[PDB]
Design a protein around this ligand. Sequence first.
Ligand SMILES: COc1cc2[nH]c(C(=O)N3C[C@H]4C[C@@]45C3=CC(=O)c3[nH]c(C(=O)N4CCc6c4c(O)c(OC)c4[nH]c(C(=O)SC)cc64)cc35)cc2cc1O
Length: 205
Amino acid sequence: KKIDFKKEEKKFYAPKRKPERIFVPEMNFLMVDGKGDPDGEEYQKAVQSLYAIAYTIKMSKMGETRLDGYSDFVVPPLEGFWWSEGKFDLKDRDAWLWTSILRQPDFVTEEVLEWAKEVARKKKPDVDTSRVKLVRFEEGECVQMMHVGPFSEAVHTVAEMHQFMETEGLRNDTGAIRKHHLIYLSDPRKANPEKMKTILRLPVS
Ligand SMILES: COc1cc2[nH]c(C(=O)N3C[C@H]4C[C@@]45C3=CC(=O)c3[nH]c(C(=O)N4CCc6c4c(O)c(OC)c4[nH]c(C(=O)SC)cc64)cc35)cc2cc1O
């Protein structure tokens, strides 16, 4: 009875190295909005805060609080949305806008999140979780592809996805509403960039 999103819903986590259409149903997420370079402290803190909350929720089964509707779950891969506002140059990593996200089971409500922030304040006092929010949404119709290799080469994968959209008659909705979406299967701090695996997912209509 432990949820493992990667196994039970593998299609969302294991595309091949070619573009495919995918419909992404409603999911529940912890999210942190932020700005700037992923090498910077703000992004690192965002990721740390998400994991602090997710593991506080998961490990609640070993404490004295029974969360309503609790199910154990394998913490899923980190994901991110990426967009810009105003005139923008890609080389300008400080201008990047993003949201860092972790999927959660349905039982995670605002009340569960508030409880986890309080527990984490005690157990993990150096992590500020105040910007973590809970967002449920249906990402919907997308194209996705596994990108193997450095982030600087993602343009190759994105271009192939764009060509697939043309071939299939799909409109590219990517922008500031339906956002460019990465799912990180590798830890970029520990992985050889040449062998990193990242899902790139772009919304379509
Ligand atoms: C109690 O039990 C547990 C608690 C636990 N916590 C964690 C955990 O915290 N984890 C795992 C892991 C992912 C993670 C993290 C901590 C982190 O601070 C962190 N940073 C990154 C990171 O930096 N990432 C991921 C994305 C990203 C980077 C990165 O380097 C970049 O290069 C600059 C990036 N460039 C770009 C682009 O260019 S996009 C265009 C994107 C991007 C990843 C993680 C694990 C754990 C296990 C437990 O059992």
